Amino acid sequence: ESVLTQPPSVSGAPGQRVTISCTGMNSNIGAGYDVYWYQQLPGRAPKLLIYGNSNRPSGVPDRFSGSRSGTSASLAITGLQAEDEADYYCQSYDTSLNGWAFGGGTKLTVLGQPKAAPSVTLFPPSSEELQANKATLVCLVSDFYPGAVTVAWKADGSPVKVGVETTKPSKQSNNKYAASSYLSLTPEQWKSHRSYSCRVTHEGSTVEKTVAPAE
Amino acid sequence: EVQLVESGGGLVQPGRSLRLPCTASGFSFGDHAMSWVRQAPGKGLEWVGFIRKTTYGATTHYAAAVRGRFTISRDDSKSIVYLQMNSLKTEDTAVYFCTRVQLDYGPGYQYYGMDVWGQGTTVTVSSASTKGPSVFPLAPSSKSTSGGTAALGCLVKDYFPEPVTVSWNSGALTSGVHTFPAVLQSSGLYSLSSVVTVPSSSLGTQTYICNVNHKPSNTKVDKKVEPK
Amino acid sequence: NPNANPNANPNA
CATH class of the missing domain: 2.60.40.10 (Immunoglobulins)
Known part of the structure; x- marks a missing residue:
């Protein structure tokens, strides 16, 4: 239950324009409280980008603009550049929570290379780990672009969430993206099923790999 | 150059306390309200609290998620604002940013966005013990x-x-x-x-x-x- | 103006 919401992600091609919505309520933007926007470059602290709905700090270029209307606000970015890739956050005071709320952030991707499908490898537990009385399945995904991806696990075809941990996509040294996911089981659990699969979905295409304990 | 430098972060067990100083330089510290914001790993920004300038009494206001456990104070003679965190919980794990509230004037009021942010200090709350991989x-x-x-x-x-x-x-x-x-x-x-x-x-x-x-x-x- | 609310605006 949030009082300010934002799309999780937006993308645009170099030179084009994107908008990022900040959807608020009668208790915040709708009550007239001003909206502030921050830009957070990867691995950096946030920077104030727009203040008071529409004002730019002296050093922020006019490719960035802010507007409001009713219960929502919008950040527009034109002439998109690779350097604009960042997470963007809106902020407004909310009367019902009595504090400064933030939207959930929007990750901006500037589409600088063609779509690339992921490579997927699913590793069963190593014999060494089984000797230590544990059994981790490791699903590694690499070389995809852009970064949106879904990783799902099944055991004998049944969806699995208990024991699963997954990383958010990380940039590779060749500018594509990679991701990792783990299913941690006991050896008895591992041996109790006949097959396990990890399904990786990227841009409407799915890659599925399977392992069997009886291999 | 305006600078805010947070310190004091690290590993802490649940239930324990940590105080984070933020040392300010390069501006008229006593004129500004100051504000703390945090960000859990991979997650969004969450506001923690603010403290007003001393001519307004240096009174404070906190997010509901930390009220009763975290407090803010300031020492204008040293240009430091502190975040005092008591009874820490695993969900308090985050980077903690110290920030300056702007003073720019708008139409009949002053704006109050956070115009300068420190680089942050990482606080990790866990009862785990050191363990090699x-x-x-x-x-x-x-x-x-x-x-x-x-x-x-x-x-x-x-x-x-x-x-x-x-x-x-x-x-x-x-x-x-x-x-x-x-x-x-x-x-x-x-x-x-x-x-x-x-x-x-x-x-x-x-x-x-x-x-x-x-x-x-x-x-x-x-x-x-x-x-x- | 709502932005003069001291709960919202520490400068007010």
């Missing part, structure tokens, strides 16, 4: 081979705290290597993997060794990864 090979096979390449790797399992570093063949092998960020498991321990894509024709002629370093436990492990 267990390194397991992720062996290549036909099930990891597609189109003349094969994936192989190392699973760096169950260590605490972060970070580990991984190299391959003592740093001589860099092409096709990716070391992933860590996951935090329900056990309170971290795990990560490192993978290399190599020519399938190199398996069984080229030796592949992952070198794992975990400074907090003084652990260095080399693990040879052999074909299935």
